[PDB]
Amino acid sequence: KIPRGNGPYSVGCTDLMFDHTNKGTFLRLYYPSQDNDRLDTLWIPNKEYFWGLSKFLGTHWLMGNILRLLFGSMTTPANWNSPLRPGEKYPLVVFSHGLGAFRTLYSAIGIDLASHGFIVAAVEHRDRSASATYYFKDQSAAEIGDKSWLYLRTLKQEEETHIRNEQVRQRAKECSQALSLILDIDHGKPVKNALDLKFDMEQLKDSIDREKIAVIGHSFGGATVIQTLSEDQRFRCGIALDAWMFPLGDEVYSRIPQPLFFINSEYFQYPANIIKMKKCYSPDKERKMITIRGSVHQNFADFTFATGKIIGHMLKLKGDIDSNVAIDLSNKASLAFLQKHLGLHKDFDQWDCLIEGDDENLIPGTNINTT
Ligand SMILES: CC(C)COc1cc(=O)n(C)c(=O)n1C
Ligand SMILES: [Ca+2]
Ligand SMILES: [Cl-]
Ligand SMILES: [Cl-]
């Protein structure tokens, strides 16, 4: 079970794809909903994602159908298409997924944020870093729902530097565009969702606090945070969850005026990566780093909740720390950081001590030495 949000509000969820193309935006929306009795949200909603995850894992394609069998009807505790809780302007998070992931696999974060009063737009990237994603070739193919699928691209050694940077830059562009889409929708611009779902986008009109916008992301998505911040000042601060820094150009490190928070796992990190994080530091600017004790790279994604303790630890989905404790610490720290840097007038400043790594399960800065 993926944990419910700890905040006061019920949480809803839907999908938005506009335009229908592989250049258009595709996102999963988590939002404060009314109290309601809708069904929960299907966690991995097409067979093709499982096939893609298998390709990502490098396994026999029978593992695809195995994963599909084990996980294909599993849900996450967000109510599908429930109405938006009206009468408040909500701050907005744009969330970026890791390599091998897709939009739906960070609902633990999405839900908990939403339950504390954020609208979260989890983008699905079309840079071929997702295990799978899809789009429509033409208007008629959108109408009848005939999907065209894009699977993860595997690279040669000589392409890595070059293509990863393109991808992270395409990712940045996708975050920016999804932001403009939501802002258009907030102003009331009619938008035909290419997915034909029972959710009225006009509910979102005048519901976004237009100035209070952050970008958050895991792994490749942590790099995406930083490229995005450097490229788009509409984002006021960023939180990078166990960022893989490799995709970034050398130019970006000094070009991040916004507040930036690094939340790391214990066992993923390494000098080359931490050195790059440290290149983002400047005295005139705002930076914080913490490290969750006994955590793994997968602690930030939803698969850390998909299996038992023993199998999870075997597969490096879980660390020595409890996955609920892990994710609670990451989310609460995130909430305090957002409150400070978006100027929110909520109670999240109760977790200011987490930002500074003041918890028995946190390490201030890093455990990695770089000398
Ligand atoms: C240089 C590549 C072959 C290395 O590919 C990685 C990709 C990725 O997404 N993440 C999170 C990583 O940690 N690595 C090492
Ligand atoms: Ca720009
Ligand atoms: Cl790890
Ligand atoms: Cl290293």
- Catalytic pick among 297, 302, 323, 330: 297
Residue 210, both tokens = 């237009």
Distance 171 CA to ligand 4 centre (A): 25
Ligand with minimal distance to 273 CA: 4
The phi and psi torsions of 125 (rounded to 5 degrees) equal -85, 140
Cα–Cα distance measured from residue 210 to residue 179, given in angstroms and rounded to the nearest whole number? 10
Residue 7, both tokens = 């905040």
- Catalytic pick among 209, 242, 302, 359: 242
Residue 255, both tokens = 């070009």
Please provide the distance, in angstroms rounded to a whole number, between the alpha carbons at the two ends of the chain: 42
Q: Count of CB atoms within 10 A of residue 129's CB?
A: 27
Domain 1-371 part of CATH 3.60.20.30 = no
Catalytic (active site) residue 254: no
The atom number, within ligand 1, closest to the CA of 155 reads: 3
Method: X-ray
Residue 339, both tokens = 């409150």
Tell me the CA distances in angstroms from 125 to 29, 102, 272, 288, 299, one per residue in order.
14, 7, 26, 27, 21
Give the pocket of ligand 1 (CB within 6 Å).
99, 160, 219-220, 244, 246
The atom number, within ligand 1, closest to the CA of 129 reads: 9
Pick the closest to residue 106 from 221, 195, 24 (CA basis): 221
Distance 261 CA to ligand 3 centre (A): 20
Instruction: Specify the residue with its C-alpha closest to ligand 1, atom 14.
Output: 244
* Secondary structure (H, E, C), 201-214: HHHHCCCEEEEEEE
Residue type, 119: I
- Catalytic pick among 10, 82, 107, 219: 219
Q: What is the resolution of this structure in A?
A: 2.1
Cα–Cα distance measured from residue 266 to residue 338, given in angstroms and rounded to the nearest whole number? 23
Ligand with minimal distance to 272 CA: 4
Cα–Cα distance measured from residue 27 to residue 248, given in angstroms and rounded to the nearest whole number? 23
Domain ranges of the chain: 1-371
The atom number, within ligand 1, closest to the CA of 219 reads: 11
Query: Which residue is associated with the tokens 């400070």?
Result: 340
Q: DSSP secondary-structure letter at 19?
A: S
* Sign, CA torsion 350/329/236/21: negative
Catalytic (active site) residue 219: yes
